Amino acid sequence: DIQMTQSPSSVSASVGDRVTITCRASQGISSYLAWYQLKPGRAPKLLIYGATRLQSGVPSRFSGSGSGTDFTLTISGLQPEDFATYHCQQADSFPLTFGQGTRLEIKRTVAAPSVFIFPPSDEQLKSGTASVVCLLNNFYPREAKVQWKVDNALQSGNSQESVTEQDSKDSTYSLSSTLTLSKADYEKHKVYACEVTHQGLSSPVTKSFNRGEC
Amino acid sequence: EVQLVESGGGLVQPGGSLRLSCAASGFTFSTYNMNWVRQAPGKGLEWLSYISTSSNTIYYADSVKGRFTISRDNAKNSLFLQMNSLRDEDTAVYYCARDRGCSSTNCYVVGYYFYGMDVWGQGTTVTVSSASTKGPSVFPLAPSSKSTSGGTAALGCLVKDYFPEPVTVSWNSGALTSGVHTFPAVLQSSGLYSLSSVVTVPSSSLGTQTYICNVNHKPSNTKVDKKVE
Amino acid sequence: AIAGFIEGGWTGMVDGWYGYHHQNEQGSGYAADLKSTQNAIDKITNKVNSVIEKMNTQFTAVGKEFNHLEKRIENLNKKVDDGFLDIWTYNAELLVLLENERTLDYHDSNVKNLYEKVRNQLKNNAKEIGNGCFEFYHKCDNTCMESVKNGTYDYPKYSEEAKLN
Amino acid sequence: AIAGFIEGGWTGMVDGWYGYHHQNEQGSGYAADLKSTQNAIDKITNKVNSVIEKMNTQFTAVGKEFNHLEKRIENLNKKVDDGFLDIWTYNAELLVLLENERTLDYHDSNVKNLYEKVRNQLKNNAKEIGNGCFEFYHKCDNTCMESVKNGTYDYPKYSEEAKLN
Amino acid sequence: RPKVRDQEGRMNYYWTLVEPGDKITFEATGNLVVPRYAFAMERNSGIIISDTPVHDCNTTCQTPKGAINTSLPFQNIHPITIGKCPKYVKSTKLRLATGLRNVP
Amino acid sequence: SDTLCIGYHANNSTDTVDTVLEKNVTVTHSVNLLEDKHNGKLCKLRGVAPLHLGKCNIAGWILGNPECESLSTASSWSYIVETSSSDNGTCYPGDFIDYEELREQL
Amino acid sequence: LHLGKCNIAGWILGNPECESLSTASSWSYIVETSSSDNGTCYPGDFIDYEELREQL
């Protein structure tokens, strides 16, 4: 198929600044290009059609132009209600290949995360599989990593993270990592720590607990 | 008004079939074109098929390879999609869309798909997996006071090994709203989802105040309440 | 060119305005063009919007009431109401008469532009028997029939077999 | 025929609208026609004067002021001021839309009238490869290039050498 | 009357034309504002509200937002026009094409 | 060997026109039939110098308002120019009957 | 705003046969009927009446 390419993957800008999101086609079209505004839980809305005009109901803050394969979506009137994922669509020929998607985020000051860690209870260890949950709140940006270390040894292949969306008021994120361990391997180890690596922290915060004091 | 209503959700085992439906009202159905655009979790939009008013020129995507069958009816104003040979990669949210037709502001003569699509619908959740329906496993987390410089604490519950997605996790049947944050579901390697939910509480009433973690699984009708202490 | 050199339109092709009817050893059927029809639709769709978007009417009234003690201004109001009506009886009925004269000429221009798209590529490789038909002097499969629609028909490449028959 | 059978115009010939590009053994360069360009300029220059000389306006005013005790006649004055404006929003914007449609058609007619001036004199003495090009099958000097521009190209006088190549 | 410009009274001003050979007649016993000067006039234009300065230039049409020398069929600046003036439209571009389509 | 190609005019013009075939079409040469420019001056009409009143309106000049004393009325004019701040007209209030007819007669 | 059987002069003056009427806070046009005879119950010469029908 005729593939599409967007750049970059995520744009972080504030209200009032200029947002430049490009979408280059692999072949020459020069007349037909679509642009959608996809929201989670809502229907997408066509913003730009043909890369020259604007759809009815769309405000005049959006703008698009280009001839050939180079096209530019210029936003000089950015509102707080427009921080969403945008997609480009080729209209000719078939198939109607959509874009990759570019998430627009609110730019603010870098904040330090608050590290929390929950020890496993007695109801989860008796079931045969226990898990330790580490919590990260009030951090920016979304690029945060959780380094699980058990008895001063880095673990891999048995952890999974879960990140929420951006906050409407604080413009922050929330992260929760879960390290899955078996019943026989839980009683062998004693120290369970959650080392946090963040851009806003000058030193890695490592919170741990005791296995016999859960 | 001009709107599209999607229906036909549920749980389909791999190797079966599923027929989707899209209702249309408030506009002429026998003059415009229709499409099928899905959205995988973690991916973007994906065009599937195209049909005309006379159902003569029918297109298919590269990911379909003739496995799907799209039909319509101009008299009943309906759009159907007979899907066959469903696998685990077909788990997406299927929508319905109408082509624009022209380049002017008001298209009085409907053309083709050369100027994108404008009308969009709500969509339905379609999940195809070989795993059966399994109730969630609720385990409470032990509270602890780790925020020394902030003087706060945290507590919550861990929900794992359930099918299908999602699970709406609340606290005190919706009464507790301060500090409640719901994490999205992440699919594990075993074929089941997992999510968490925490409540930010101060460290003054950590070892005295308790909360009830309410777990509500909507497709399986499973409601498990576990006290966190 | 309806009821002229060409007889008329067909009811088999309902997927557009213009197109071609394939007839060879591989099959047959009706097929409309996606390039020439979509461009010609935008010419007529902007023509309808040329008298709607440019007619910048305001939130006012055209009709008005008057008393019969003011028959001096009621006659001028008759020149306002029926005077604009007599212009709109003249100008608007001329627009529908002249733009449909343009549309029947532009559809005739869409005939001739599609004819010159075929005739300049099939000077000696097709027989002109009228009614928009072009019988090839060689083998022309479904890939060859789609090349004349998009305009990708090379003349010296297909003239090697048409000169023998 | 811009963005059609012909690609577009050139920036080398700035001495007129239409013309020819000479390319032979004696030299090369751009040259515009003195007969076809000057006649076609007078078509467009009289078109601009068609809406200026015929618009016989008088020494009067279009706008007028009124009092708010005369709102019965102020509504008719709104039908005089904005009513003639809505005609001028309709009629004047249609003229620029239709005469430029006539100008683009007459320039396309200036292409076809210059094409039939060449094609009727070069039926077998030139190869039609598109984009307004006509490659001769024999020697054509600068005197021969000026004969096709003025229309003084005899067909049997130059067909003796073109039939050999 | 209501107090306008610290004056509780009004004064209605009237006017008429006098034909050549006609004799005007005034007769009143009070509340008459008699004229001091007269304006002898002879004609075959309207009013303009603007803040543009005056110069010794010459043109064929006048507009409040500036001088206009047309020699053009249409204009789009102001409807209140005085003299041999072009038509007023609400459009922003009415450019008549004379040359070919600018495609390189 | 020779090449005779029909040439057409093209330049770097940015003025676009409106056609029924396509909107926003760039042309090479064009005459702007819509006057969008303005000199910003009050010129004459057919050699006749107009009458400018300044801060006073017509009713301040036809009645003799005392704040419009610095004024040299010419023997002929073609139009009367008022200002947006023309408040020094009728210094005494009143109902100017048939006032709109007198603004066109003079 | 729909006045029913009464015309504008029955509404702007307060005719008693047009009591069952709920006047909205905003409108765009006034609708009269062909049998609008229950307007001015007392006769008179409504001076400048045609300009008042366009102002409201």
Numbering used by the authors:
A (entry chain K): 1 to 214
B (entry chain I): 1 to 229
C (entry chain G), D (entry chain B): 5 to 169
E (entry chain A): 227 to 270, 273 to 332
F (entry chain A): 10 to 115
G (entry chain E): 60 to 115
The authors write:
To provide the structural basis of the unique recognition pattern, we determined the cryo-EM structures of the 28-12 Fab in complex with the trimeric HAs from HK/68 H3 and WA/11 H1 at 3.7-Å- and 3.5-Å-resolutions, respectively, with imposed C3 symmetry. Overall, 28-12 appears to form more contacts with the fusion peptide and the HA1 residues adjacent to helix A in H1 than with those in H3. For H1, the D19HA2 within the fusion peptide forms hydrogen bonds with S54HCDR2, N56HCDR2, T57HCDR2, and Y112HCDR3; S299HA1 forms hydrogen bond with Y108HCDR3. Moreover, W21HA2 on the fusion peptide forms hydrophobic interactions with V109HCDR3. Another two amino acids from HA1, including V40HA1 (which is a hydrophilic amino acid N40 in H3) and L300HA1 also form hydrophobic interactions with V109 and Y108 both from HCDR3. It appears that 28-12 forms more contacts with H1 (48 contacts) than that with H3 (17 contacts). The mutations D19AHA2, W21AHA2, and V40AHA1 in H1 significantly decreased H1 HA reactivity to 28-12, while the mutations D19AHA2 and W21AHA2 in H3 did not affect H3 HA binding activity to 28-12. Collectively, these results indicate that the epitope in the fusion peptide and HA1 is indispensable for 28-12 to react with H1. The epitope dependency on the distant HA1 residues and the fusion peptide in the primary sequence probably makes the epitope in H1 HA more conformational by 28-12. We hypothesis that cleavage of H1 HA0 may cause conformational change and destroy the integrity of epitope in H1 HA, thus resulting in reduced binding activity to antibody 28-12.
